[PDB]
Amino acid sequence: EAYWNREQEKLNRQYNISHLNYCEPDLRVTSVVTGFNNLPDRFKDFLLYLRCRNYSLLIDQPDKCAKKPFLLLAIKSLTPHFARRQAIRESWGQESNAGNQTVVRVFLLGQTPPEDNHPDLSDMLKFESEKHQDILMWNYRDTFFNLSLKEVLFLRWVSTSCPDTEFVFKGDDDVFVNTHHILNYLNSLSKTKAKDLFIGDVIHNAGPHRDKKLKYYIPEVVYSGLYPPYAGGGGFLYSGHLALRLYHITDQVHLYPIDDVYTGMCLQKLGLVPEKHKGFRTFDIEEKNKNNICSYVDLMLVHSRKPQEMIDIWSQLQSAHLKC
Amino acid sequence: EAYWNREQEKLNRQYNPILSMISHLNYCEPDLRVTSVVTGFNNLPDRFKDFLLYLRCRNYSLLIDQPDKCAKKPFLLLAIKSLTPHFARRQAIRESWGQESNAGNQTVVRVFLLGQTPPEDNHPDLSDMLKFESEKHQDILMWNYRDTFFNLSLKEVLFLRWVSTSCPDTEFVFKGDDDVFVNTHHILNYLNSLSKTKAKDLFIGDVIHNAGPHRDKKLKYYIPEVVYSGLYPPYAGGGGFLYSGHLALRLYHITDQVHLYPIDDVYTGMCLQKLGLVPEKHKGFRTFDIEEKNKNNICSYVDLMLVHSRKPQEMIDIWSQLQSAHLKC
Amino acid sequence: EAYWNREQEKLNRQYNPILSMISHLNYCEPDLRVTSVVTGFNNLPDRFKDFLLYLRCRNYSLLIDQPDKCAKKPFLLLAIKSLTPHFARRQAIRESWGQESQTVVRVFLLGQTPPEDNHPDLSDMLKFESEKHQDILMWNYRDTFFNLSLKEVLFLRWVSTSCPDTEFVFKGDDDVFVNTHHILNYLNSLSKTKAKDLFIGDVIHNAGPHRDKKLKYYIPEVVYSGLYPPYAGGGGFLYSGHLALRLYHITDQVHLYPIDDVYTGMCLQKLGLVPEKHKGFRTFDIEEKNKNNICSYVDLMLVHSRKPQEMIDIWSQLQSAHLKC
Ligand SMILES: *[C@@H]1O[C@H](CO)[C@@H](O[C@@H]2O[C@H](CO)[C@@H](O[C@@H]3O[C@H](CO)[C@@H](O)[C@H](O[C@H]4O[C@H](CO)[C@@H](O)[C@H](O)[C@@H]4O[C@H]4O[C@H](CO)[C@@H](O)[C@H](O)[C@@H]4O)[C@@H]3O)[C@H](O)[C@H]2NC(C)=O)[C@H](O)[C@H]1NC(C)=O
Ligand SMILES: *[C@@H]1O[C@H](CO)[C@@H](O[C@@H]2O[C@H](CO)[C@@H](O[C@@H]3O[C@H](CO)[C@@H](O)[C@H](O[C@H]4O[C@H](CO)[C@@H](O)[C@H](O)[C@@H]4O)[C@@H]3O)[C@H](O)[C@H]2NC(C)=O)[C@H](O)[C@H]1NC(C)=O
Ligand SMILES: *[C@@H]1O[C@H](CO)[C@@H](O[C@@H]2O[C@H](CO)[C@@H](O[C@@H]3O[C@H](CO)[C@@H](O)[C@H](O)[C@@H]3O)[C@H](O)[C@H]2NC(C)=O)[C@H](O)[C@H]1NC(C)=O
Ligand SMILES: C[C@@H](n1c(=O)[nH]c2ccc(C3=NC(=O)[C@](C)(c4ccccc4)N3)cc21)C(C)(C)C
Ligand SMILES: C[C@@H](n1c(=O)[nH]c2ccc(C3=NC(=O)[C@](C)(c4ccccc4)N3)cc21)C(C)(C)C
Ligand SMILES: C[C@@H](n1c(=O)[nH]c2ccc(C3=NC(=O)[C@](C)(c4ccccc4)N3)cc21)C(C)(C)C
Ligand SMILES: *[C@@H]1O[C@H](CO)[C@@H](O[C@@H]2O[C@H](CO)[C@@H](O)[C@H](O)[C@H]2NC(C)=O)[C@H](O)[C@H]1NC(C)=O
Ligand SMILES: *[C@@H]1O[C@H](CO)[C@@H](O)[C@H](O)[C@H]1NC(C)=O
Ligand SMILES: [Mn+2]
Ligand SMILES: [Mn+2]
Ligand SMILES: [Mn+2]
């Protein structure tokens, strides 16, 4: 009865009109979806062009994985977030080579076109791309409900341009990440748990928010029932082996407005469950402990932090072992 | 969990551009790891043991060839499966419905498909008579593999290879058993009534949907659960099917991506499914005999394409009566 | 007793090997004997007088020709009957369903609208249109309703000499909308045998001449007696290029008839063939309620009739009709 659930099981019995590169507006949804013309315009645009995901790469760094990476940092960002990206470049997103355990960094961007009243910062983006060589940008509209598109297109770039990275971190450009804690965690892993790695702040048996004022509002007419297990809150860590299997399976899952929920549907179709790890505190530390750098040593991700805070915490963290 | 299903999905991952990050085609030594992973292997019948141990070998060569069989482009290539000692079945087909012709644009050619019946399996050495029969009629194709029941999908793959290298321009292909009567006249009339689009992906026969593997150990099509699990794809079986040369060239290309299966007609269905096509049922394919009440009326043979099964004498008799059934019926 | 039947039976005896024991094709003086052997000649309408007086003439020349229009072997020859002042009709077809693209060619079939019949001189305009689109065929005869069967014959001649290789031929009016997409799907859905003797359209059986003097298809009894053969009329029909030459060769054996579509039926009947009815040929229109719904068009092949702007409109409402039907 809900549109996405109705169309997903239709897609499923196919694998037991194209849904991948039919890029004209499907207008059948206007009469099929109850109350279409009253929904917010993001639902309208999401349902009209759900069946198009063959968008091209505008800005690429094809040599980013010329040397085999051990951990690929892939940070979701928007065009005007220059300070966020530069803070990450200087703090936890530094590229390293501490023993051929190469850590590489890319930012994942869509477009902020002039027709959506975005200011033209494209000439500034290219200068940033030339100088830091860490920008990947595709020609889709970088909107909130196009973030699963951002997920799939990044998975495609890994299959073509970085298929041999050992591990992959994917997060938001406003989360602080303890990369030192992540590296030692990865190094401490058996090669059977490393193969199917997917950890984060996992939530089980969650349903869609129906309050039309909240961020993740999904009406019953669009989706029905409960969400599969999914890591959320702005960061999860998984294997490059799982990343390749993930991208292959995206063909059999329709896009979903919530990107972290879409990634849980792909893991489920693969017969896996994301593993909860307490180190992903997508809800912040208590204000009492924010002044104690030692409250950061044993976590892996804390949301959210401003560009100044990320540089400050990273600087204090470098000499934290002498105080904790 | 079954062995064939497990190995075929391994092959799907090998050919998938994303998921792919010894040969299954020319590894002709015994594949001994099947003795460990196939539960109850050494208790399986001999044909199952030999099928699993050499499943990865299909690069067999022609010992007898008719390389100029399709010099003139044929409208209908008749490809009849046969065994070496079936001299009477083949000769009866030559004199009856398997006659070659050049009737005004519509050329019909004929080949018999043979494997080996070697002396080490106690077969009588009939190679001299076979070479004599080949030189006389020039319609025998023979490959250097053991012609057993569980190697018929090998006979299927090797014939498609021969079509792609020696008869690619044939408009249509009929493949059948050497004991089925085929109304070639009715088949030609049906082929000529086809729209240009229906003739490109033509594949008709006696098709069965949602069929499963026979689990009785004593029947002819027995397949245990250690070998195959689940249901069969749709496939035409029971004596013969009809399809286009365009389809045959597509079929041979896809054969590399499908592991051999002990039932040849099932294997062809697996290839069709992988190609995205579905074989179409045609009621003229009587893989069971005609009703006993009508098995004597020559009328019953004007309106079918194929009937199973007829002895060599019966084929000649029915065909002779067909040459005048237009006035009687 | 009737004139055309009596004269047709004379032709049938002359063309029979056995029964054979002025011309009827290039006698272009007034056949004055019809004034006495046709009872009531003086009181017939003027179109019947001119038809009876020059029935035995048909060696008219090509004033404007596109000689290499079929230099590339066409899959479909679009032949449209049109009158010289119909510039809007022809250009609307050129931009819509008559687009020359399985290569498709297009020709418009015209006679002469001479000044002696009080026609405005549009010759300079026609030559400009012909020089710019290269799709005008015009013969030196009076383009009259009762001369349309003569239009059929001269076009069939032109096919046999200037475009004999065409696979299929469509012949229609310049005011009918034709779904070029749909009809091409029908043509590719044909076996060769059926594609060799194809002749489809709105076929009528056991039709007769209308005898009411004030109707358009009025034919008096002194001209034609009996019923009509099966014939396809009402806007257009589709047939094979092989059938076209079989049609031209035997037009010599059939006297011209005032009703062009009936004449083609007589030509087919003398060939031993029967035209095949096809419900996709809606010579009558479609129900007003089902109009505006573009799906009522992508199912049919021919609809009569539409104005120039409508043809351009429906053709563009068609290129997006698969989204909904
Ligand atoms: C995810 O990203 C994809 C790809 O970027 C997005 O899909 C694109 O979506 C846009 C809509 O935002 C769509 O644009 C429409 O194409 C239609 C084709 O007919 C047009 O109807 C429509 O034209 C409107 O916008 C034009 C430019 O603004 C105007 O020139 C035109 O007059 C129309 O104007 C309407 O909207 C403007 C708003 O500015 C308004 O001022 C006007 O009054 C009028 O109401 C669009 O051009 C693209 O076709 C899609 N691209 C592809 C490749 O498919 C998708 O929207 C994103 N998903 C989410 C959930 O955001
Ligand atoms: C389908 O056809 C293929 C090819 O014809 C066929 O594979 C062949 O199978 C036979 C077994 O029937 C293999 O022959 C054996 O190889 C092993 C190891 O080399 C030997 O142990 C066997 O020798 C035995 O038989 C000898 C008698 O000749 C005795 O001297 C000895 O004591 C043993 O009993 C035998 O040489 C052969 O290697 C393959 N050939 C190829 C090219 O792969 C397959 O069996 C057929 N499948 C079915 C299902 O029938
Ligand atoms: C069909 O087309 C033919 C060819 O145009 C028409 O024949 C033409 O008919 C006109 C009569 O309208 C003839 O003009 C006349 O000749 C007579 C005697 O010479 C004269 O008295 C008239 O003043 C006029 O000049 C013309 O000769 C004739 N053309 C030829 C070459 O035959 C015919 O009329 C048309 N038929 C119909 C049914 O409209
Ligand atoms: C999440 C990453 N992100 C991205 O990569 N593209 C985004 C596009 C939109 C947003 C986005 N979040 C919102 O609260 C807001 C304002 C929104 C508007 C309307 C309804 C719901 C939500 N819009 C975030 C994007 C980020 C922020 C880390 C870069
Ligand atoms: C079918 C065509 N055929 C062929 O071309 N090679 C064949 C090899 C074996 C057989 C074959 N059928 C059987 O019932 C039997 C006895 C069998 C033995 C063991 C298990 C199951 C079945 N063996 C048939 C072959 C034919 C007969 C028309 C030529
Ligand atoms: C039909 C095609 N047509 C053609 O090609 N030449 C024509 C010459 C005359 C006519 C024509 N229609 C008539 O109803 C009319 C006025 C007539 C008057 C008196 C009695 C009977 C008929 N005369 C049509 C011609 C057309 C129009 C699609 C191009
Ligand atoms: C198919 O090809 C394979 C390899 O291309 C052949 O395997 C060889 O078999 C010969 C037989 O004497 C051995 O000497 C070689 O050592 C084998 N090579 C390999 C690479 O395995 C096989 O013979 C062919 N199958 C046939 C011809 O039936
Ligand atoms: C995707 O492919 C389709 C058809 O191949 C094409 O129409 C479309 O332009 C492509 N998508 C984009 C966003 O260009
Ligand atoms: Mn956030
Ligand atoms: Mn049999
Ligand atoms: Mn009209």
Side-chain angles (χ1 to χ4, degrees):
Chain A
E1 267 67 3
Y3 186 69
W4 191 93
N5 319 49
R6 140 168 65 258
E7 306 279 306
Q8 180 49 42
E9 290 274 352
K10 275 167 65 142
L11 184 55
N12 281 344
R13 81 185 46 112
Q14 187 269 21
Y15 286 103
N16 153 73
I17 195 85
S18 125
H19 72 301
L20 292 184
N21 58 6
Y22 172 74
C23 300
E24 301 296 323
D26 172 23
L27 299 154
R28 151 192 46 240
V29 279
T30 51
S31 325
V32 162
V33 186
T34 300
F36 178 89
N37 308 80
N38 269 15
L39 289 159
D41 276 39
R42 64 185 176 275
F43 287 97
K44 302 190 184 198
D45 274 303
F46 174 87
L47 297 153
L48 286 180
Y49 306 97
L50 168 159
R51 302 168 165 278
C52 177
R53 55 175 84 175
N54 58 311
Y55 304 95
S56 318
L57 247 184
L58 296 195
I59 304 189
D60 185 17
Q61 322 279 345
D63 40 348
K64 173 60 60 163
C65 311
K67 149 158 208 83
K68 166 162 186 309
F70 176 77
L71 173 60
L72 162 65
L73 305 172
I75 318 305
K76 303 192 286 151
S77 195
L78 287 158
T79 292
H81 292 186
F82 297 102
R84 278 189 202 185
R85 291 196 289 280
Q86 182 61 35
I88 287 161
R89 272 185 205 110
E90 297 180 10
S91 36
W92 57 268
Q94 300 191 48
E95 298 182 343
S96 301
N97 204 328
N100 283 6
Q101 264 204 145
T102 280
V103 168
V104 292
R105 181 194 59 243
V106 291
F107 297 102
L108 319 179
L109 285 80
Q111 262 180 323
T112 46
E115 45 272 30
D116 306 343
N117 306 313
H118 287 101
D120 164 48
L121 302 155
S122 64
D123 291 340
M124 195 139 303
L125 189 50
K126 267 126 55 143
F127 173 78
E128 181 191 7
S129 173
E130 271 158 16
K131 180 183 246 306
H132 297 283
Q133 325 193 88
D134 51 12
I135 302 293
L136 302 189
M137 200 260 284
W138 294 258
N139 72 43
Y140 70 100
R141 280 201 314 136
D142 198 341
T143 68
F144 188 60
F145 270 18
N146 262 350
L147 281 174
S148 57
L149 206 54
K150 180 173 286 212
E151 160 95 327
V152 180
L153 294 168
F154 163 65
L155 290 183
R156 173 170 100 209
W157 175 90
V158 169
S159 82
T160 78
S161 301
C162 207
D164 57 325
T165 173
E166 217 55 37
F167 297 102
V168 180
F169 175 87
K170 174 144 177 282
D172 293 0
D173 65 1
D174 67 338
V175 312
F176 179 89
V177 177
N178 195 345
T179 311
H180 287 336
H181 194 347
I182 285 198
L183 283 171
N184 297 10
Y185 175 92
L186 288 175
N187 280 136
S188 92
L189 283 198
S190 85
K191 279 331 110 177
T192 188
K193 186 248 203 203
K195 202 180 113 129
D196 293 331
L197 203 65
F198 198 104
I199 75 175
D201 188 350
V202 184
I203 282 315
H204 288 270
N205 300 300
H209 299 48
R210 314 301 193 175
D211 203 342
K212 44 227 309 173
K213 275 287 219 103
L214 291 195
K215 211 195 216 198
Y216 310 94
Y217 157 68
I218 305 285
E220 296 83 296
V221 49
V222 156
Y223 183 78
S224 53
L226 311 171
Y227 288 142
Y230 68 93
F236 42 67
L237 181 71
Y238 57 96
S239 69
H241 182 280
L242 193 57
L244 291 178
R245 299 205 275 139
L246 275 167
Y247 175 61
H248 163 91
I249 220 76
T250 67
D251 273 10
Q252 309 167 18
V253 187
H254 272 309
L255 307 181
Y256 193 77
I258 310 306
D259 60 335
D260 286 350
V261 155
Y262 175 81
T263 207
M265 304 169 161
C266 299
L267 274 154
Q268 162 160 310
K269 183 155 288 265
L270 282 172
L272 296 155
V273 279
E275 184 203 299
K276 205 270 176 273
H277 195 303
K278 91 88 206 173
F280 291 79
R281 291 193 101 261
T282 69
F283 327 88
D284 211 315
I285 316 320
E286 320 304 74
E287 267 305 323
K288 53 201 305 152
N289 311 313
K290 299 209 183 174
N291 292 104
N292 190 15
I293 176 84
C294 303
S295 59
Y296 287 83
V297 52
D298 261 25
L299 47 79
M300 311 202 247
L301 167 141
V302 35
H303 172 279
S304 74
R305 290 285 181 282
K306 303 179 175 185
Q308 226 168 329
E309 290 152 350
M310 262 161 213
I311 293 172
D312 190 27
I313 301 166
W314 185 256
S315 210
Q316 294 179 48
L317 203 82
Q318 294 318 96
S319 78
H321 61 290
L322 316 171
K323 218 214 163 273
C324 313
Chain B
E1 66 93 358
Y3 177 80
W4 190 93
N5 306 80
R6 257 191 295 113
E7 287 303 306
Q8 178 61 31
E9 186 65 44
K10 286 188 195 178
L11 224 57
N12 301 330
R13 284 193 235 299
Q14 267 174 246
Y15 286 94
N16 180 255
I18 321 294
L19 283 195
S20 80
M21 312 201 240
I22 80 184
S23 192
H24 69 288
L25 292 160
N26 64 354
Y27 183 84
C28 300
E29 286 246 356
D31 182 11
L32 289 180
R33 30 170 192 161
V34 305
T35 69
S36 101
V37 313
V38 176
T39 285
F41 169 87
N42 260 284
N43 320 308
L44 287 170
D46 279 1
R47 64 174 178 287
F48 286 97
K49 292 200 211 174
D50 278 340
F51 175 81
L52 297 170
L53 294 161
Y54 308 106
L55 157 74
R56 286 164 189 282
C57 185
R58 73 176 69 177
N59 56 310
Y60 296 103
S61 325
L62 273 154
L63 299 168
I64 300 167
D65 187 8
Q66 311 297 327
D68 319 313
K69 169 63 60 177
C70 296
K72 320 183 154 94
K73 172 241 195 52
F75 177 73
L76 175 65
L77 164 72
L78 302 171
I80 307 314
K81 297 174 292 149
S82 186
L83 284 156
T84 298
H86 294 182
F87 294 104
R89 302 188 164 178
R90 293 200 284 287
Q91 179 59 34
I93 283 154
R94 291 191 192 103
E95 300 178 23
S96 54
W97 56 267
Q99 290 173 245
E100 304 188 313
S101 145
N102 313 51
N105 282 44
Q106 296 210 147
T107 280
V108 172
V109 292
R110 171 191 71 248
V111 285
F112 294 103
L113 307 183
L114 280 73
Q116 285 220 267
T117 56
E120 61 259 23
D121 311 325
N122 309 310
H123 287 112
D125 186 4
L126 289 153
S127 73
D128 267 276
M129 308 261 312
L130 181 60
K131 262 87 203 194
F132 173 90
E133 181 199 14
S134 168
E135 290 156 337
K136 198 201 190 334
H137 306 273
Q138 314 222 257
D139 55 12
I140 275 150
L141 301 179
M142 205 266 260
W143 288 261
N144 65 327
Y145 69 96
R146 281 202 316 135
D147 199 337
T148 68
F149 187 69
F150 269 16
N151 263 348
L152 279 166
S153 96
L154 200 59
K155 176 173 290 185
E156 160 85 311
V157 171
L158 284 176
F159 164 69
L160 296 180
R161 193 230 270 152
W162 180 87
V163 176
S164 103
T165 70
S166 301
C167 200
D169 324 284
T170 172
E171 212 59 31
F172 289 118
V173 172
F174 172 86
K175 174 138 155 295
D177 285 351
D178 66 1
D179 70 338
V180 304
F181 178 92
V182 188
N183 192 344
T184 318
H185 293 314
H186 183 287
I187 293 225
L188 285 161
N189 297 353
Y190 167 89
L191 289 178
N192 291 132
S193 81
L194 284 193
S195 71
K196 246 174 82 73
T197 166
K198 225 183 163 223
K200 207 179 85 103
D201 292 353
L202 172 78
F203 194 114
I204 56 151
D206 192 358
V207 177
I208 170 165
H209 290 273
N210 300 287
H214 293 17
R215 304 300 196 191
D216 188 333
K217 268 197 47 84
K218 302 182 305 312
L219 324 161
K220 183 196 201 192
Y221 298 94
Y222 163 59
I223 302 287
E225 301 97 293
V226 297
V227 176
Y228 189 87
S229 50
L231 299 183
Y232 287 154
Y235 70 97
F241 41 63
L242 180 64
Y243 56 105
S244 79
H246 177 85
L247 200 30
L249 299 159
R250 304 177 64 202
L251 280 159
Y252 176 58
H253 174 275
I254 213 57
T255 53
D256 277 4
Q257 286 169 242
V258 183
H259 268 127
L260 308 172
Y261 195 79
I263 318 295
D264 60 344
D265 286 351
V266 172
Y267 175 81
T268 297
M270 298 172 159
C271 293
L272 281 180
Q273 193 186 62
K274 186 142 296 262
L275 271 188
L277 310 165
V278 179
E280 174 205 325
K281 166 131 192 205
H282 188 305
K283 47 216 73 52
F285 282 76
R286 333 273 316 251
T287 65
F288 223 5
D289 208 335
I290 317 154
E291 55 263 359
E292 269 270 310
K293 331 158 82 163
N294 280 123
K295 195 190 324 178
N296 288 181
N297 190 359
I298 197 57
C299 294
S300 324
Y301 297 80
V302 192
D303 292 304
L304 40 76
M305 329 199 89
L306 164 155
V307 60
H308 166 276
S309 70
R310 293 305 183 253
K311 282 154 173 175
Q313 239 171 325
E314 298 175 322
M315 257 152 213
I316 290 176
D317 188 12
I318 297 156
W319 184 256
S320 175
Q321 298 194 24
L322 227 55
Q323 294 331 106
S324 99
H326 47 65
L327 51 98
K328 219 293 172 203
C329 290
Chain C
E1 194 61 278
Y3 184 76
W4 190 94
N5 318 51
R6 180 200 327 146
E7 292 307 303
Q8 182 56 25
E9 262 304 331
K10 292 177 178 152
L11 225 40
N12 290 346
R13 283 178 228 118
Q14 148 164 6
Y15 279 101
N16 179 276
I18 304 156
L19 285 211
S20 34
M21 316 190 257
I22 64 200
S23 195
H24 80 290
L25 303 165
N26 48 38
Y27 182 76
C28 302
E29 289 286 301
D31 190 347
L32 292 163
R33 271 281 200 297
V34 315
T35 64
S36 69
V37 308
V38 171
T39 41
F41 178 91
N42 291 312
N43 289 333
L44 295 177
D46 290 2
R47 64 187 188 274
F48 285 90
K49 295 197 196 175
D50 293 21
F51 175 75
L52 292 170
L53 273 155
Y54 311 90
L55 169 59
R56 313 176 167 271
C57 182
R58 60 175 80 183
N59 59 302
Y60 302 107
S61 289
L62 258 154
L63 293 200
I64 295 157
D65 188 51
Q66 322 302 325
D68 301 20
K69 161 70 59 189
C70 288
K72 204 190 237 72
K73 188 185 155 322
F75 181 63
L76 188 40
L77 168 63
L78 289 189
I80 313 302
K81 303 181 293 157
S82 152
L83 289 156
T84 78
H86 297 173
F87 299 88
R89 295 195 186 179
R90 293 198 291 279
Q91 191 67 12
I93 304 170
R94 277 194 201 94
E95 291 165 9
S96 68
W97 59 263
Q99 274 174 294
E100 271 175 337
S101 325
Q102 260 188 190
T103 69
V104 180
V105 290
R106 180 202 52 240
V107 291
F108 292 103
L109 304 155
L110 287 80
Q112 266 181 295
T113 39
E116 48 242 56
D117 302 314
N118 297 324
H119 286 295
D121 187 2
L122 299 156
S123 48
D124 278 357
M125 306 268 296
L126 194 75
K127 197 94 217 73
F128 178 88
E129 175 192 13
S130 124
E131 246 155 22
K132 195 205 207 241
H133 303 286
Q134 311 168 311
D135 57 354
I136 296 293
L137 300 170
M138 193 251 284
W139 291 259
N140 50 329
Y141 72 97
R142 286 210 306 128
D143 202 326
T144 277
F145 187 66
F146 271 16
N147 261 347
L148 283 174
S149 90
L150 173 68
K151 173 171 309 202
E152 190 96 7
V153 163
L154 296 156
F155 160 65
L156 280 176
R157 187 225 267 150
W158 179 86
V159 157
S160 92
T161 177
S162 298
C163 188
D165 40 321
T166 178
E167 203 65 32
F168 295 91
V169 175
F170 177 82
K171 207 186 138 264
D173 292 354
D174 68 3
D175 76 334
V176 309
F177 178 80
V178 187
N179 192 339
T180 301
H181 283 336
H182 187 307
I183 73 103
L184 277 186
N185 292 346
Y186 176 96
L187 284 206
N188 292 323
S189 153
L190 289 181
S191 96
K192 163 41 102 153
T193 56
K194 176 103 219 87
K196 197 207 188 180
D197 324 285
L198 168 71
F199 201 114
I200 46 161
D202 203 333
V203 178
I204 298 313
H205 286 264
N206 260 32
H210 308 147
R211 311 289 201 193
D212 184 1
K213 278 209 284 288
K214 54 190 64 223
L215 324 183
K216 158 196 251 170
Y217 300 104
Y218 159 60
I219 305 281
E221 306 79 340
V222 289
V223 172
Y224 181 93
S225 37
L227 304 185
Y228 288 138
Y231 73 99
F237 42 61
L238 188 64
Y239 55 99
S240 119
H242 171 75
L243 186 42
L245 188 269
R246 292 243 287 141
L247 278 171
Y248 177 49
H249 173 274
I250 57 103
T251 58
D252 284 324
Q253 330 213 351
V254 199
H255 271 140
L256 318 166
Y257 193 73
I259 307 328
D260 65 334
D261 293 345
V262 160
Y263 176 77
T264 312
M266 298 155 166
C267 278
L268 282 180
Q269 164 161 103
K270 207 179 265 318
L271 276 180
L273 315 173
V274 163
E276 185 187 10
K277 157 71 148 273
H278 196 340
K279 7 80 215 18
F281 287 81
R282 299 296 273 95
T283 57
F284 312 96
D285 215 345
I286 56 194
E287 327 77 33
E288 322 223 352
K289 278 245 73 185
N290 103 320
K291 313 217 257 217
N292 118 270
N293 200 258
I294 178 85
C295 323
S296 27
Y297 294 78
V298 78
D299 196 307
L300 57 60
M301 330 183 35
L302 184 132
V303 51
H304 165 99
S305 50
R306 301 277 170 274
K307 306 184 225 92
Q309 293 177 263
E310 306 187 301
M311 274 178 215
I312 284 166
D313 184 40
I314 315 188
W315 187 246
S316 300
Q317 283 184 254
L318 210 52
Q319 301 299 350
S320 146
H322 69 46
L323 275 86
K324 210 256 193 72
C325 282

